[PDB]
Write a protein that binds this ligand. Structure first.
Ligand SMILES: N[C@@H](Cc1cc(I)c(Oc2cc(I)c(O)c(I)c2)c(I)c1)C(=O)O
Ligand SMILES: N[C@@H](Cc1cc(I)c(Oc2cc(I)c(O)c(I)c2)c(I)c1)C(=O)O
Ligand SMILES: N[C@@H](Cc1cc(I)c(Oc2cc(I)c(O)c(I)c2)c(I)c1)C(=O)O
Ligand SMILES: N[C@@H](Cc1cc(I)c(Oc2cc(I)c(O)c(I)c2)c(I)c1)C(=O)O
Length: 559
């Protein structure tokens, strides 16, 4: 029996959580309760197989069971076409209502009256809005959510204790989903082979002391864990993830020195810990990569006799000695190396041919460095808000076809690069910046993949996972774009508009700035400033009220 094997490893509590998460990811539209009913049934059934390893249907597969319950065009098929149906049906942007939070005491009451249904609510919601969220990590968030309500619903002030923490979680939560969506995307649109090269780079950076073999052993388990979590096998993923966390801690001494504090904590806490670890200290006297990848006369022989490994070795050896490079940059060099050999090992005298392959990297390394240097200066010079507006404008001209809600969303997140990385010294900027920009651009890609409207976005998105940032950065203003004509419906007054927080106002204002640019593509920074300002003064005056709607309607219709 499989269902029992898992229940035994994960425990009862977690098993219920993963099964719940597992259903909410497959059926994002069904109600909370319905799911609960499917979980409890599955939970009991397991308990029998735990007792009777030979009971009825215990020999089944997690996909058939989970599959059957969910069935009580996708179901009218069978394993595994049936499964690949649910996976292919996951919605990255469901039409689900805005998840707002009621009055502090309101929640606090419901948290006490029933603590279990409260959390399952949490997991349900978060899981349905993020059908790719890293299951194991979600358990980590759940426990931190629980801790918040148990310590804040019992103090002098609550909305001063809780809210501040609920903020930091939704934020860290959004980063987690993002980060993971890139992983699932990599595996899917490019295959695991692609995912392995990737994994070899970050790991060789965090664990410079580890031997190449050790790194491969982890990249293999790691590739298996994420394949499962991304494919929908959440139970096995958590089991595998925990086994690996154990492995890492046991061999801790042949991997990284930073794994100490991490390895002395509860399962959930050490997994998250290992996942966020900082780079270990790089070894001192390391031979020059040149010696073995350029000067040796057995390069081509090694490429031929074992390309996949030789390359692995190369990436690992370059990555470990360059913590200051972004993962994507390292893959670009890795690709350049493969192409230069592929060509050179056929030519007359190979050695001469690829003797200058390091020369071909220089260009690829400064392109990233300069951009990060420029937008960081700009960041200090303009502040987060004005900086995003600068991006808003820049990217709206590159891809005007894209929907406004999306351009605002992405651009803001692109803008967050400045404050999230610029405070770091040069050595830590690029890997913080460019790897982050890759996540954000992937959100653009997955959203855009639903209802495509720009072949430029589709090109930059599907042509190469590693070149995405450079590709987008290279785009020139789309001249084939056709000025969007004035609608006005976009500016229909709404009471709330006058009683908005600073964040809300900034969003409303950036939304307007995108519509402006879409309408007048040939506008200049100066005149955009003018139309913005005038209209800004307009909204501020009309809010001073009297009969607002009239003001905004009367004066508005005029504008
Ligand atoms: N910027 C990249 C770099 C990075 C990638 C991987 I792959 C990795 O290895 C793990 C190990 C475990 I255990 C996890 O639960 C996870 I998630 C990743 C680590 I450490 C760092 C990222 O963080 O995505
Ligand atoms: N006044 C500057 C021009 C400049 C404008 C922007 I807006 C900018 O910020 C980005 C961020 C990303 I991410 C991109 O892909 C791109 I293209 C530009 C940068 I850096 C430089 C100069 O002349 O130096
Ligand atoms: N129609 C929306 C409400 C809405 C009204 C306006 I008027 C508006 O336009 C601006 C322009 C600037 I410049 C501002 O600084 C601000 I605040 C609002 C926007 I965007 C949205 C709805 O029905 O939800
Ligand atoms: N008078 C023209 C129509 C027109 C109305 C407005 I109001 C306007 O100003 C803005 C300001 C912002 I901010 C926007 O996002 C947008 I879209 C338009 C402009 I320029 C033109 C006609 O009837 O031909």
């Amino acid at each position: 029996s499989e269902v029992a094997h898992r229940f035994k490893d994960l425990g009862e509590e977690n098993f219920k959580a993963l099964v719940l998460i597992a259903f909410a990811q497959y059926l994002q539209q069904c109600p909370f309760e319905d799911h609960v009913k499917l979980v409890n049934e599955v939970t009991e059934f397991a308990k029998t197989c735990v007792a009777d390893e030979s009971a009825e249907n215990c020999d089944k597969s997690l996909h058939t069971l989970f599959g059957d319950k969910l069935c009580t065009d996708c179901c009218a098929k069978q394993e595994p076409e049936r499964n690949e149906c649910f996976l292919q049906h996951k919605d990255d942007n469901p039409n689900l209502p805005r998840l707002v939070r009621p009055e502090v005491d309101v929640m606090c009451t419901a948290f006490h009256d029933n603590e279990e249904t409260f959390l399952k609510k949490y997991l349900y919601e978060i899981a349905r809005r993020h059908p790719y969220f890293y299951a194991p990590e979600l358990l980590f968030f759940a426990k931190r959510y629980k801790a918040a309500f148990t310590e804040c619903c019992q103090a002098a002030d609550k909305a001063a204790c809780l809210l501040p923490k609920l903020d930091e979680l939704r934020d860290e939560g959004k980063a987690s989903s993002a980060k993971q969506r890139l992983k699932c995307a990599s595996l899917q649109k490019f295959g695991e082979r692609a995912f392995k090269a990737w994994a070899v780079a970050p790991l060789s950076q965090r664990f410079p002391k580890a031997e190449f073999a050790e790194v491969s052993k982890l990249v293999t388990d790691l590739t298996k864990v994420h394949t499962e979590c991304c494919h929908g096998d959440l139970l096995e993923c958590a089991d595998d993830r925990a086994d690996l966390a154990k492995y890492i801690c046991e061999n801790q001494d042949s991997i990284s020195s930073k794994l100490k504090e991490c390895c002395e904590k509860p399962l959930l806490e050490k997994s998250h810990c290992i996942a966020e670890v900082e780079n270990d200290e790089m070894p001192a006297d390391l031979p020059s990569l040149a010696a073995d990848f350029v000067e040796s006369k057995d390069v081509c022989k090694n490429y031929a006799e074992a390309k996949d490994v030789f390359l692995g070795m190369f990436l690992y050896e370059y990555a470990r000695r360059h913590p200051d490079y972004s993962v994507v940059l390292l893959l670009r060099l890795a690709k350049t190396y493969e192409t230069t050999l592929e060509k050179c090992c056929a030519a007359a005298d190979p050695h001469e041919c690829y003797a200058k392959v390091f020369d071909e990297f220089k260009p690829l390394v400064e392109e990233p460095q300069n951009l990060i240097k420029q937008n960081c200066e700009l960041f200090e010079q303009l502040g987060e808000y004005k900086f995003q507006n600068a991006l808003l404008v820049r990217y709206t001209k590159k891809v005007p076809q894209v929907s406004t809600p999306t351009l605002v969303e992405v651009s803001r997140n692109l803008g967050k690069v400045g404050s999230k990385c610029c405070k770091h010294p040069e050595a830590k900027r690029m890997p913080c910046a460019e790897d982050y920009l890759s996540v954000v651009l992937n959100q653009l890609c997955v959203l855009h993949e639903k209802t495509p409207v720009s072949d430029r976005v589709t090109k930059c998105c599907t042509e190469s996972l590693v070149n995405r940032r450079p590709c987008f950065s290279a785009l020139e203003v789309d001249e084939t774009y056709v000025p969007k004509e004035f609608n006005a419906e976009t500016f229909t007054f709404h009471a709330d508009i006058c009683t908005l927080s600073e964040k809300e106002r900034q969003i409303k204002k950036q939304t307007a700035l995108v519509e402006l640019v879409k309408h007048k593509p040939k506008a200049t920074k100066e005149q955009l400033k003018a139309v913005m300002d005038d209209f800004a003064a307009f909204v501020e005056k009309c809010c001073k009220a009297d009969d607002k709607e009239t003001c905004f309607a009367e004066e508005g219709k005029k504008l």
